[PDB]
Amino acid sequence: SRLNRESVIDAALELLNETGIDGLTTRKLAQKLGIEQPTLYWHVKNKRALLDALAVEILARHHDYSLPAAGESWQSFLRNNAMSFRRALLRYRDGAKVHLGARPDEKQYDTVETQLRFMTENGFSLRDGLYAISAVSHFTLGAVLEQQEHTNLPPLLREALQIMDSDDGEQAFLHGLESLIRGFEVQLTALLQIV
Amino acid sequence: SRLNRESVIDAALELLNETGIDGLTTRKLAQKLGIEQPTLYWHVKNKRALLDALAVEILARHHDYSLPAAGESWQSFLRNNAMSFRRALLRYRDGAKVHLGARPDEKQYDTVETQLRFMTENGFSLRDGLYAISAVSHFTLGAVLEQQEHTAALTDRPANLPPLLREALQIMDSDDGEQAFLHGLESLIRGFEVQLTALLQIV
Ligand SMILES: Cc1c2c(c(O)c3c(O)cccc13)C(=O)[C@]1(O)C(=O)C(C(N)=O)=C(O)[C@@H](N(C)C)[C@@H]1C2
Ligand SMILES: Cc1c2c(c(O)c3c(O)cccc13)C(=O)[C@]1(O)C(=O)C(C(N)=O)=C(O)[C@@H](N(C)C)[C@@H]1C2
Ligand SMILES: [Cl-]
Ligand SMILES: [Cl-]
Ligand SMILES: [Cl-]
Ligand SMILES: [Cl-]
Ligand SMILES: [Cl-]
Ligand SMILES: [Cl-]
Ligand SMILES: [Cl-]
Ligand SMILES: [Cl-]
Ligand SMILES: [Cl-]
Ligand SMILES: [Cl-]
Ligand SMILES: [Cl-]
Ligand SMILES: [Mg+2]
Ligand SMILES: [Mg+2]
């Protein structure tokens, strides 16, 4: 079939959903595309290059709250950004593991720069804005990964696992997300006061 | 060599450090131990069973702050517990990935039950106590996984930059992620406290 970048990514994402990250291979990608491996090699040099690209394209296609709305608070931005990031990570099997494989791509520079600058324009030092942003990202990746890799008992644990199965993990995520945001606000608002 | 449980695990952890999780195999374990594959199979059925066991043993051996001290605040417990969990996950190559491959095994049940009961004995409902312990777990595992997968990716290929990102990467690379971790940990804890203290008040 067609092997422009867009069609290769389409096929890879389809395969990802079928196999998972570990079972995804360039050999199986070649098969899905109806092509010989050396043909695929001209387009995709190895699994790592493939995964680097998927990490970028999954956000490009499906993470629609990368940027704050005009006039939006930093609190509401981190919240909306985290929900959107989570949704994008959940969209494909082992999506969180696909993301972890890499740091911001050149295609993502402008976006992540704007995110960092936005936090600084709302009172954070670059360092404290970064720590906020990284905490949200790491909490969210953790919440998603635990979901994805889960794809006699004592009483509380029993009922915990009962609770922690009630939904897909969204409840514990949203609650933790609020705790995180409020903790950041307490820090920022204290200035030089002992807090 | 010796193939009691403790010895198989010792050799597997040693191998994990050598190869990382993707590169660890039962074939390579057999070689390390000086035995044939069907011999190893009697002891260890497959890679998954092996990893299950590693995930448990890594915590058993190296996660020293599983339980609160007598009289300890819930805040201080979560702090000390997270620091310990992080250290244990960082101790072996791809440790967080090894951990993620499972939920509490029987041998852990009682530790985690004691953790949940302790939160409830300090004013949390089971639900809110669990959300707290979970958020700590998720934040910590995410932070370690990013650090470890970043290490792995670098040995496959090298890593222009806008100024804040540059500065942010220089800041992130200045240690192993510990500063960012400890700062985010305090934010999370204080957020839990604010929520707990509110009771039924709008907050
Ligand atoms: C600022 C930053 C970010 C990310 C990141 O990995 C990163 C890093 O690895 C080193 C230094 C800085 C950053 C994100 O992954 C990302 O997920 C992302 O790419 C991203 C994006 N592309 O829109 C985000 O939404 C951000 N958000 C989850 C807080 C976060 C931003
Ligand atoms: C409560 C709980 C925990 C964990 C966990 O995986 C889990 C789950 O998968 C479902 C429901 C509840 C839990 C932990 O992994 C663990 O890391 C853990 O086993 C653990 C331990 N065994 O000591 C911890 O220290 C805990 N801490 C990091 C918050 C956390 C506790
Ligand atoms: Cl083509
Ligand atoms: Cl294209
Ligand atoms: Cl595309
Ligand atoms: Cl491959
Ligand atoms: Cl707003
Ligand atoms: Cl939606
Ligand atoms: Cl023996
Ligand atoms: Cl033994
Ligand atoms: Cl042992
Ligand atoms: Cl194997
Ligand atoms: Cl204390
Ligand atoms: Mg990232
Ligand atoms: Mg766990």
What is the DSSP code string of B80-125? HHHHHHHHHHHSSTTHHHHHHT----HHHHHHHHHHHHHHHTTT--
Q: By CA distance, what is B192's nearest residue in A?
A: A179
Q: Which residues of B touch A107 (CB under 8 A)?
A: none
Contact call for residues A144 and A86 (beta carbons, < 8 A)? yes
Q: Is the dihedral of CA A128, A131, A137, A143 positive or negative?
A: negative
Tell me, in angstroms, the distance from the centre of ligand 9 to residue B105's CA.
Answer: 25
Domain span(s) for CATH 1.10.357.10 in chain A: 66-194
CA dist A190 → A54, A119, A123, A126, A193 (Å): 41, 16, 11, 17, 5
CB < 8 Å from B in window 5-64 of A = 22, 46, 48-49
Contact call for residues B124 and B170 (beta carbons, < 8 A)? no
Q: Residue A158 is which amino acid?
A: R
Do residue A128 and residue B192 have CB atoms under 8 angstroms apart? no
Half-sphere exposure of A172 (CA within 13 A, CB side): 30
Contact call for residues A186 and A195 (beta carbons, < 8 A)? yes
CA–chain centroid gap for B198, Å, is 31
Q: Is the dihedral of CA A162, A166, A169, A170 positive or negative?
A: negative
DSSP state of A106: G
Q: By CA distance, what is B22's nearest residue in A?
A: A22
Do residue B113 and residue A181 have CB atoms under 8 angstroms apart? no
Domain span(s) for CATH 1.10.357.10 in chain B: 66-202
Resolution value, angstrom units: 1.8
Comparing CA positions, the residue from B70, B65, B77, B67 lying closest to residue B189 is B77
Do residue A116 and residue B194 have CB atoms under 8 angstroms apart? no
- Categorise residue A13: left if φ over 0, alpha if ψ from -120 to 50, beta otherwise: alpha
Tally A–B CB contacts below 8 A: 176
For this PDB entry, the determination method is X-ray
Of B133, B144, B181, which is best to mutate to test ligand 2, by the most ligand atoms within 8 angstroms of its C-beta?
Answer: B133
Q: Is the dihedral of CA B12, B18, B23, B29 positive or negative?
A: negative
Residue A112 near ligand 1, beta carbon < 6 Å: yes
User: In the CATH scheme, what architecture does the domain A1-65 have?
Assistant: Orthogonal Bundle (1.10)
Comparing CA positions, the residue from A100, A58, A16 lying closest to residue B153 is A100
Nearest to A179 among B117, B180, B191 (CB): B191
CA distance B144 to chain A (A): 9
Alpha-carbon gap, residue B171 to A100, rounded angstroms? 19
Alpha-carbon gap, residue A132 to A124, rounded angstroms? 9
Q: How many CB atoms neighbour CB A45 within 10 A?
A: 12
A contact test, residue of B118, B140, B146, B181 with most A CBs within 10 A: B146
The CATH number of the domain covering residues in B66-202: 1.10.357.10
The structure tokens listed for A133 are 């942003």
Please, what CATH class does the domain formed by A66-194 belong to? mainly alpha
Domain span(s) for CATH 1.10.10.60 in chain B: 1-65
Nearest to A179 among B135, B167, B169 (CB): B135
Nearest CA to ligand 1 atom 1: A112
